[PDB]
Design an enzyme around this catalytic site. Structure first.
Site, PDB file in Angstrom:
ATOM      1  CE1 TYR A  90      84.402  62.327 -36.249  1.00 51.11           C
ATOM      2  CE2 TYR A  90      86.169  63.152 -37.636  1.00 51.11           C
ATOM      3  CZ  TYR A  90      85.272  63.332 -36.604  1.00 51.11           C
ATOM      4  OH  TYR A  90      85.230  64.514 -35.906  1.00 51.11           O
ATOM      5  CG  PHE A  92      86.541  61.570 -44.116  1.00 50.20           C
ATOM      6  CD1 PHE A  92      86.666  62.215 -42.898  1.00 50.20           C
ATOM      7  CD2 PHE A  92      86.171  62.304 -45.229  1.00 50.20           C
ATOM      8  CE1 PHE A  92      86.423  63.564 -42.790  1.00 50.20           C
ATOM      9  CE2 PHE A  92      85.925  63.656 -45.132  1.00 50.20           C
ATOM     10  CZ  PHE A  92      86.049  64.287 -43.911  1.00 50.20           C
ATOM     11  CB  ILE A 110      80.233  67.488 -45.130  1.00 51.96           C
ATOM     12  CG1 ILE A 110      81.138  66.297 -44.812  1.00 51.96           C
ATOM     13  CG2 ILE A 110      80.651  68.732 -44.366  1.00 51.96           C
ATOM     14  CD1 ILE A 110      82.565  66.438 -45.273  1.00 51.96           C
ATOM     15  CE1 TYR A 161      83.250  73.986 -44.284  1.00 53.27           C
ATOM     16  CE2 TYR A 161      83.780  71.649 -44.237  1.00 53.27           C
ATOM     17  CZ  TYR A 161      83.186  72.754 -43.662  1.00 53.27           C
ATOM     18  OH  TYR A 161      82.528  72.625 -42.460  1.00 53.27           O
ATOM     19  CG  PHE A 201      90.798  67.476 -41.461  1.00 54.80           C
ATOM     20  CD1 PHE A 201      91.039  66.592 -42.504  1.00 54.80           C
ATOM     21  CD2 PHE A 201      89.481  67.739 -41.102  1.00 54.80           C
ATOM     22  CE1 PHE A 201      90.004  65.959 -43.144  1.00 54.80           C
ATOM     23  CE2 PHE A 201      88.440  67.109 -41.742  1.00 54.80           C
ATOM     24  CZ  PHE A 201      88.705  66.221 -42.769  1.00 54.80           C
ATOM     25  CG  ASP A 202      87.497  66.419 -36.836  1.00 49.88           C
ATOM     26  OD1 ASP A 202      87.836  66.117 -35.672  1.00 49.88           O
ATOM     27  OD2 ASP A 202      86.352  66.820 -37.123  1.00 49.88           O
TER      28      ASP A 202
END
Length: 107
Positions: free
Chosen positions: A26, A99, A56, A82, A36-37
């Protein structure tokens, strides 16, 4: 809501089922924002199973709608991850998450 935009190559049939530990390269992104990730940055391609609500709901529903080899593109709604809460320092509240998901899985 999970909006899937699959880049074509894959197999179209190896779907994640319940309790299948599946592998995703991912790459996270914010709408009008940066990453962010990333499992691509860590080079640890996030071996996770289906059916435990580890991930999530915007990332869980997009995984079962893909197959092996496929390269979809999530557009995650705020209310599933979130939207009111927000993560401290990473995800603000009311964020529409993006994503880069490629399902090159196991099991």
């Amino acid at each position: 809501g999970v909006e899937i935009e699959t880049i074509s190559p894959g197999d179209g049939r190896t779907f994640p089922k319940k309790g299948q530990t599946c592998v995703v390269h991912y790459t996270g992104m914010l709408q009008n924002g940066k990453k962010f990730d990333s499992s691509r940055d860590r080079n640890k391609p996030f071996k996770f199973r289906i059916g435990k609500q580890e991930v999530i709901k915007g990332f869980e529903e997009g995984a079962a709608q893909m197959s092996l080899g496929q390269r979809a593109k999530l557009t995650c709604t705020p209310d599933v991850a979130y939207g009111a809460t927000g993560h401290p320092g990473v995800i603000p509240p009311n964020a529409t998450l993006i994503f880069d998901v490629e399902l090159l899985n196991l099991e």
